[PDB]
Design a protein around this ligand. Structure first.
Ligand code: EGR
Length: 454
């Protein structure tokens, strides 16, 4: 209700510890904070965790109570609801281990719970489909920022983190700070009256740019006709699927070209009608760079086909061979399925429709009665749209595993290039033989954060 003043009180913080890696880590916790006045779902609370030193005058890793970074991780996966996390948490889904490490690192952590596509309200009405997830994420950011100086850590040093859908969530938050589009939703929630622009973005395999992901996917996996994706399940593409695949691949050239992406010197990155060109060379060079890094560590990079090694250097790559050994994960279309059965179909549904299309192609060739999601909505939840009406985070670190087949490498790469083309700081890589996952390189992530904040 409006009796909730959204005022944080450090006296709520109570001491706890967690034994991790030969050390007990001392911290304080304040759990289940209602971060908006008018929540529609019980999941809409946030936890706050604080290195013990910050309640005793002391410092950790060069940070203090007023200066510490605020890590805002989320537990969002598959665009499902992400409960408020907790270093003591051991039920799926959780990044408790990351929270432990971030506390050890001296970060304040604010783990907000976020509605997802399956979330329902008191009556059993869906209230977690787009753009609920980013609205909630923003509402939690606003809470923190409204509470600057009551809440430990620096609210001008918020750094979101997330994996997959959670990665897109982190990314979208960094891209869309103070976007007018979300104002009516936040106001309807009674979120705190403060800004929601953040400082830095960490994102692992962000499943974003959803309305172009079908094109990017086929540009990559066309020619590979068997797919493999909890139960082991697999199929073989139909002629119809193959038709869509070939068409989706072709269309990707047209989309990619109009982006006007450029390389470091200044060359327009392009593709011809057959999907070949300087942009494909960039993808290839990034995989080559990923393989070299592993090679230098004594890793057998020939686990996957295609790599040319000359002496001690990965000099080239047969991209098609690699992709064939990587294997295709999703059928066609990969994201906007024609029978509305994908997570993203469900994501774009509403209180009325469980699922919608979000591309012209899938709406046109729909095998089930369906409507197209609002064009402004699709646009609003795509990070890329804010780079080409908001204040954007200036610092980004993006990772997508070279063994991750959940979305085309082209998706994170486009994001990284746009960021770079437009003057943002951007640390990008496709970590060798890394599957769909996140938080696997915390030592480098934390070092990157420490580079920004100290
Ligand atoms: C399965 C874990 O990762 C996900 O969050 C995720 C989300 C999506 O929207 C996807 O399309 C996907 O392949 C994975």
């Amino acid at each position: 209700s409006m009796s909730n003043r959204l005022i944080f009180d450090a006296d709520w913080l109570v001491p706890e510890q967690v034994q991790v890696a030969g050390q007990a880590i001392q911290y304080y916790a304040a759990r289940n904070i209602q971060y908006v006045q008018h929540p529609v779902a019980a999941i809409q609370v946030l936890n706050v965790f604080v290195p013990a030193a910050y309640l005793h005058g002391s410092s950790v890793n060069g940070y203090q109570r007023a200066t510490a970074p605020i890590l805002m991780p989320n537990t969002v996966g598959g665009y499902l609801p992400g409960p408020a996390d907790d270093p003591q948490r051991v039920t799926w889904p959780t990044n408790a281990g990351t929270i432990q490490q971030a506390l050890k690192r001296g970060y304040v952590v604010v783990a907000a719970g976020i509605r997802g596509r399956t979330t329902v309200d008191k009556s059993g009405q869906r209230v977690g489909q787009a753009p609920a997830f980013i609205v909630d994420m923003k509402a939690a950011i606003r809470y923190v920022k409204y509470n600057q100086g009551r809440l430990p850590g620096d609210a001008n040093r918020i750094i979101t983190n997330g994996t997959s859908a959670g990665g897109a969530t982190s990314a979208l938050a960094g891209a869309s700070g103070n976007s007018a589009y979300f104002e009516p939703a936040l106001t309807a929630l009674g979120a705190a009256p403060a800004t929601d622009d953040i400082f830095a973005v960490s994102a692992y395999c962000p499943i974003h740019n959803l309305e172009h992901a079908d094109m990017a996917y086929e540009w990559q996996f066309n020619g590979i006709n068997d797919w493999h994706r909890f139960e082991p399940v697999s199929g073989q593409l139909t002629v119809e699927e193959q038709a869509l695949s070939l068409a989706l691949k072709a269309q990707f050239s047209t989309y990619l070209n109009q982006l006007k992406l450029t390389a470091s010197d200044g060359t327009h990155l392009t593709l011809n009608e057959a999907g070949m060109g300087s942009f494909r060379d960039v993808v290839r060079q990034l995989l080559i760079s990923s393989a070299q890094t592993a090679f230098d560590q004594g890793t057998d990079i020939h686990k996957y086909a295609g790599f040319v090694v000359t002496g001690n250097q990965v000099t080239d790559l047969d991209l098609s061979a690699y992709l064939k050994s990587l294997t295709r994960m999703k059928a066609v279309p990969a994201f906007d399925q024609l029978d509305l059965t994908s997570p993203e179909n469900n994501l774009f549904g509403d209180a009325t429709a469980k699922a919608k299309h979000f591309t012209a192609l899938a709406q046109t060739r729909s095998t089930v009665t369906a409507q197209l999601a609002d064009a402004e909505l699709i646009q609003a939840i795509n990070p890329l749209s804010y780079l080409t009406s908001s204040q954007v985070a200036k610092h980004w670190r993006i990772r997508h595993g070279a063994a991750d087949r959940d979305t085309s490498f082209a998706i994170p790469i486009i994001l990284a290039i746009m960021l770079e083309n437009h003057g943002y700081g951007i640390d990008f890589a496709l970590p060798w033989d890394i599957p769909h996952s996140g938080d696997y390189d915390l030592g480098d992530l934390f070092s990157w954060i420490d580079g920004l904040c100290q």
